[PDB]
Amino acid sequence: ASGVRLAIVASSWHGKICDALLDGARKVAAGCGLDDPTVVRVLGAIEIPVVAQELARNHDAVVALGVVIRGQTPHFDYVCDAVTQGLTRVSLDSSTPIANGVLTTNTEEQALDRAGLPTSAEDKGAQATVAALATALTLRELRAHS
Amino acid sequence: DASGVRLAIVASSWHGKICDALLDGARKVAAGCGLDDPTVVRVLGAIEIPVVAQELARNHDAVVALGVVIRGQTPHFDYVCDAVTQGLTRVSLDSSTPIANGVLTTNTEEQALDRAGLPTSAEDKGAQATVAALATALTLRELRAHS
Amino acid sequence: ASGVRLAIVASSWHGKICDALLDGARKVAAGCGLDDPTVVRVLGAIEIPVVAQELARNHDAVVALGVVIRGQTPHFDYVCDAVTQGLTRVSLDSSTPIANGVLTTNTEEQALDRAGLPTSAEDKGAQATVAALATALTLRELRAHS
Amino acid sequence: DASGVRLAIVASSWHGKICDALLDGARKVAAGCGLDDPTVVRVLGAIEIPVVAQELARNHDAVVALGVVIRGQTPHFDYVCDAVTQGLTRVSLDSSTPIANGVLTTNTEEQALDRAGLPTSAEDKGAQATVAALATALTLRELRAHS
Amino acid sequence: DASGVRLAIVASSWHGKICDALLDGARKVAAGCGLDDPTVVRVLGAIEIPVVAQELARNHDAVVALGVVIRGQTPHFDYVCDAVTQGLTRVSLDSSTPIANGVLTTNTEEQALDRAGLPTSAEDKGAQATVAALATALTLRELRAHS
Ligand SMILES: O=c1[nH]c(=O)c2[nH]c(=O)n(C[C@@H](O)[C@H](O)[C@H](O)CO)c2[nH]1
Ligand SMILES: O=c1[nH]c(=O)c2[nH]c(=O)n(C[C@@H](O)[C@H](O)[C@H](O)CO)c2[nH]1
Ligand SMILES: O=c1[nH]c(=O)c2[nH]c(=O)n(C[C@@H](O)[C@H](O)[C@H](O)CO)c2[nH]1
Ligand SMILES: O=c1[nH]c(=O)c2[nH]c(=O)n(C[C@@H](O)[C@H](O)[C@H](O)CO)c2[nH]1
Ligand SMILES: O=c1[nH]c(=O)c2[nH]c(=O)n(C[C@@H](O)[C@H](O)[C@H](O)CO)c2[nH]1
Ligand SMILES: [K+]
Ligand SMILES: [K+]
Ligand SMILES: [K+]
Ligand SMILES: [K+]
Ligand SMILES: [K+]
Ligand SMILES: [K+]
Ligand SMILES: [K+]
Ligand SMILES: [K+]
Ligand SMILES: [K+]
C-alpha cells in the first residue's frame, strides 16, 4: 500500500475523543508505508461530506472521523442521518472509498471505549483507515492497467 | 478572521421569539468575524428553507439556516424535520457550498428557549451554526485553487 | 401578489377533510388578488409528487393538500416517507417552492381539527398557501430584474 | 374510454398466495377500464422491483408495483421497505411516469391476507393501486401538450 | 441454463466464519447454473460494498452483495444498515443492473448463523441472493433488444 494517496478529515466537537481517533488513523498509515497523508479538520459532523467531496478529486481514499453523543432532544437522529446520506453520495459520485469512522453512542464512556485510548477496548479510527486502504488497492487491481 | 467571505442567513418565522433569538446570535458572530452586513432572508416555515437556500448558494460562499420545530401531538414533527435533513444535504453537494443546519428540534418549548441564546440560556445553536459555516468556507478556499 | 401563477394539487383520500383544506386555500388565494388558481385533483398522496413536477413547469408556486391517518399497520410511515422525499426533490429540481399542506395525524378527530371547519382550532390549508405565495414573492425580489 | 393508456405491472414472488391475489385485482381493473392485455413481469423479491420498473417506464404511460413484506424477528423488515420506498420514488420522477405503490407492509400474515382481495377480505390494495396509476396517467395526458 | 450471464460477487470480511458460509452457498448456485468461474472480490466492511459493486457493474450482467451486520450496544447498527440500503439501490438504477442484497442484519450472533447456510442452519441467504441476481438478469435480457 505504498503507492496509494490517502486523505483524512476529522471533526472537532468533543476534542479529546477526536484526537484519539486521528491518532489511530495516522499510525495505521505510517505502518502501511504512507508517510504524511492529507489531514483536514472541521468543526462538526455535518460539515464533513462537503470537504470529502473536494478531497476525492485528488486522492485514492478518504477517511472521515467524528463523534456524536445522544443528548435529551431528538437532535442526535438528524446529525447522524446527514453523515449517512452525505458520505454515501460522495463515495458513488467520485468512485472512491469513503470510510465512515464517525462514532454514534448513547453515553460518553462508550465513545471513549471505541477511540483507542490507553484503557479502551477498541479503536474504530484504526479500523476505518484499514477499510479505506484495502478498498483502494482492490479497485486498482480491478481497473485498467498493464 | 473571515473578512473575505460572502455569507447568507435564512430564518423561518414559526415561533417569533426563538427565531429572533437565533438570528441575533448568528448576526453577532458574523460581525465579530469581520462581516458587517450579510444577506438575511425571512420565510414562513422550515420546509421553505431548502428552496430559498438553493437560490442563495449561487451567489454566496456560506449559507446558514435557522428555525424551530417543536413536537406536537401528531407525528407531524418527524416529517417536517426529515424534509430539512434531505433538503439541506442535497443543496450542499449540488453547489459544493457549506450549508449550516441551525434549525432546532425539541420536545418541549423550554428546551427550545434554553438553546436559543437568550439572557438565561444554557447555549446558543444559532451562533454555533454560523461558526460552522464560516470555518468550512475558509477551509475549502485553502484546499481549492490559488496562485 | 396578483402577478403570481398559483397551482394547487389536492388528494381525494378522506374526502370531507380534503374539501375543507381546498376551500381554505381558495379563500386566501382570492383574498390576495388571485381569483382563479390551477386546481388539480389526485386520488392518493403518493401521486402528488409526479403531478406537482408537471405543474412546476409553468407556475410560480405549488400547494399540495392531503390527509394521511395512522392505522393498525406500519403503512402510515411509508406513505409519509414517499411524500416527504418527492416534494423535496420536486422543489429543488425546478427551483419552485412546493408547499407541504398534507396533514399527518394519529386519530381522525385531530385531522378534522386542523382542517378549518366551523369549530376547528386552525386551518393548515390556508397556512400552506400563504407559505407558497410569500416564498414565490421572495424569490421574485431576489432574482433578475430590472 | 380510458383505453389509450399503455400499462405495465410488475409483481414479486415472495409469498405465493397473496401476490397472485394482488395481481388478480390489478388485472380486473385494467380490463374494466378498456385495457385487455397489459405488460406483466414477475420478479423474485421486492428489492428487484425498482430496476424492472425503470425498464418498463421507457415505453409505458403507467407502472404498477405489487408485493408483500411481512415482519419477522430481525429488523430486516425495516430495510426491505426502505429500498422499495426509495427506489420507486426515484423512478417516478426520473421518467415523469406514475409508479403505483401496491406493496403491502404488515405485522402479521392475517393482516396481509385481509388487504389482498381474497373471497373474505376487508379490502383490495391491488385494485386501488391500478386505479391510482390509470387516473394519474389520464390527468398528465390532459395537462401536457395536445393540439 | 444461465451459462451466458456474467456474474460478480462481492463479500465483506467482518465476522469471518459467516462470510465464508455466505460465499460458499453463492458459489454453489453459480456452479449449478452453468457458471464455473465468477468474479469474486473481498472487502473489509459492509459500507465498502457499494463502491466495489459500482466498478463490477461496468463489466457484468449481475452483482451479488454478501455480509453480516450484528447489533451492538450503540445505535451504530441502524447507520451501517442505512448506508448499505441507500448505496445499493442507487447503484442498481444508475447502471440498470440487478444488485442482490445478501447482507444479513441480525440481533444475535446465533440468528446470523442460522441464515448463513451452515450444516445445521435453517436457511442459506447467500444462495437466495444469487438466484435473485441471475433470474433478474435473464429477465432484463428477454425484455431488452434482440434480433
Ligand atoms: O460488515 C460490518 N458488520 C458490522 O457488524 C460492523 N460494525 C462495524 O462497525 N462495521 C464497520 C464497517 O461497516 C466499515 O468498515 C466502516 O464503518 C467504514 O469506515 C461493520 N461492518
Ligand atoms: O460532531 C458533532 N457531534 C455532536 O454531538 C453534535 N451536536 C451538534 O449539535 N453538533 C453540531 C453539528 O452537527 C453541526 O456543525 C451543526 O448542526 C451546525 O450545522 C454536533 N457535532
Ligand atoms: O392520501 C392517502 N392517505 C392515506 O391515509 C393512505 N393510505 C393509503 O394506503 N393510501 C394509498 C395512496 O397513498 C396510494 O394511492 C397507494 O400507495 C397506491 O400507489 C393513502 N393515501
Ligand atoms: O418552523 C416550523 N416549525 C414547526 O413546528 C411547524 N409545524 C408546521 O406545520 N410548520 C409549517 C411549515 O413546515 C411549512 O410552512 C408548512 O408545512 C407549509 O408547507 C412548521 N414550521
Ligand atoms: O418480497 C419480499 N418480501 C419479504 O418480506 C422479503 N424478505 C426478504 O429477505 N426478501 C428478499 C428480497 O428482498 C431480495 O430478493 C433479496 O434481498 C435479494 O436481493 C423479501 N422479499
Ligand atoms: K479519486
Ligand atoms: K483489471
Ligand atoms: K457558491
Ligand atoms: K491548493
Ligand atoms: K416554475
Ligand atoms: K436582484
Ligand atoms: K413514460
Ligand atoms: K395542456
Ligand atoms: K452492466
Q: Which CATH number fits the domain that encloses residue B31?
A: 3.40.50.960
Within 10 angstroms of residue E146's Cβ, the number of other Cβ atoms is 6
Among D141, D145, D144, which Cα is nearest to D6's?
D141
Q: Residue D17: phi, psi to the nearest 5?
A: -50, -50
| Nearest ligand to the CA atom of E58 | 14
Interface contact flag, B55 C143, Cβ < 8 Å: yes
Asked if C106 and B52 come within 8 Å (Cβ–Cβ), the reply is: no
Residues C106-143: b if buried by 16+ CB within 10 A, e if exposed: eeeebbbbbbbeeeeeebbbbbbbbbbbbbbbbbeeee
Resolution of the structure in the document, Å = 2.8
Grid coordinates in use for D52? 424492472
CA distances to C65, C67, C140 from C56, rounded to whole Å, are 15, 22, 15
Residue in B49, B81, B88, B101 to alter for ligand 2 test, most ligand atoms within 8 A of Cβ: B101
Rounded Cα–Cα distance for residues A133 and A96 (Å):
11
The rounded Å distance from CA E54 to ligand 6 centre is: 14
Residue bearing the CA closest to ligand 4, atom 12: B45
Given a contact as 3+ CB pairs under 8 Å, which chains touch E?
A: A, D
DSSP strands (E only) in C1-146: 6-10, 38-41, 61-69, 98-105
End-to-end CA distance of chain E: 20
CA distance C18 to C31: 20
Alpha-carbon dihedral sign for residues C74, C76, C78, C80: negative
The C-alpha cell that represents D100 in the structure block: 403505483
Query: What is the total count of domains within chain A?
Result: 1
Asked if B41 and C138 come within 8 Å (Cβ–Cβ), the reply is: yes
Domain that holds residue D118: 1-147
| CA proximity to B29, closest of B129, B136, B137 | B129
How long is chain A?
146
B106-113 LR contacts (CB < 8 Å, sep 24+): B106/A73, B106/A74, B106/B68, B106/B69, B106/B70, B106/B71, B107/A72, B107/A73, B107/A74, B107/B70, B107/B71, B108/B70, B108/B71, B109/B70, B111/A72, B111/A73, B112/B15, B112/B18, B112/B68, B112/B70, B113/B18
Whether D76 is catalytic: yes
List alpha helices for chain E, DSSP H: 16-32, 49-56, 76-95, 109-114, 125-143
B2: distance to nearest CA of chain C, Å? 25
CA distances from A110 to A63, B24, C78, E107 (A): 21, 36, 33, 19
CB distance C54 to D140 below 8 Å: yes
D and C touch with 3+ CB pairs <8 Å, answer: yes
Q: Which residues of chain A have a CB within 8 Å of the CB of E44?
A: 127, 130-131, 134-135
CA distance A48 to A33: 26
Which of E10, E12, E13, E14 to mutate for ligand 1's pocket (most ligand atoms within 8 Å of CB)? Answer: E14
Pocket lining: A68 vs ligand 2, CB cutoff 6 Å = yes
Contact D144 C53 (CB under 8 A): no
Q: How far apart are CA A89 and CA A80, in angstroms?
A: 14
- Alpha-carbon distances, residue E95 vs C23, E47, E59, E138, E141 (angstroms): 45, 19, 11, 16, 14
B-C Cβ pairs (cutoff 8 Å, strict): 76
Partners of A68 in the beta sheet?
Answer: A104
Give E55's contacts in chain A (Cβ within 8 Å). Answer: 95, 139, 142-143
Decide: residue E88, CB within 10 A, 0-12 exposed, 13-18 middle, 19+ buried. Answer: buried
Question: Rounded to a whole number, what is the distance in Å from the CA of B59 to chain C's nearest CA?
Answer: 11
How many residues make up chain B in this entry?
147
Q: How far apart are CA E84 and CA E86, in angstroms?
A: 6
For residue A102, the surrounding DSSP H or E stretch is: strand A98-105
Burial A2-34 (b: 16+ CB within 10 A, else e): eebebbbbbbbbbeebbebbbbbbbebbeebeb
Contact list, B144 vs chain A (CB under 8 Å): 54
Chain E hits for A127, CB-CB cut-off 8 Å, are 44
Asked whether A80 lines ligand 2 (CB < 6 A), one says no
**Smallest Cα–Cα separation from B140: which of A37, E15, A49?**
A49
Q: Are E23 and E9 in contact (CB under 8 A)?
A: yes
Tell whether E46 is in a known binding site. Answer: yes
> Which of B12, B13, B14, B106 to mutate to test ligand 4, by most ligand atoms within 8 A of the CB atom?
B14
Binding positions of D for (2S)-2-hydroxy-3-oxobutyl phosphate: 73-74, 115
Contact A43 B81 (CB under 8 A): no
**CA A85 to CA E8: how far, in whole Å?**
26
What is the interface size between D and E, counted as CB pairs within 8 Å?
A: 72
Q: How far apart are CA E43 and CA A131, in angstroms?
A: 8
φ, ψ of residue B10 in degrees (nearest 5): -120, 125
In this complex, do D51 and E135 lie within 8 Å of one another by their Cβ atoms? no
C-alpha cell at E11: 463479500
C33, amino acid identity: G
Burial class of residue E20, CB neighbours in 10 A (0-12, 13-18, 19+): middle
E50 CB neighbours in chain A (<8 A) are: 88, 91-92
Name the residue with cell 388539480. Answer: C40
| C131 and C99 Cβ atoms separated by less than 8 Å | yes
Find, among A27, A31, A54, A24, the residue nearest to A42 by Cα. Answer: A54
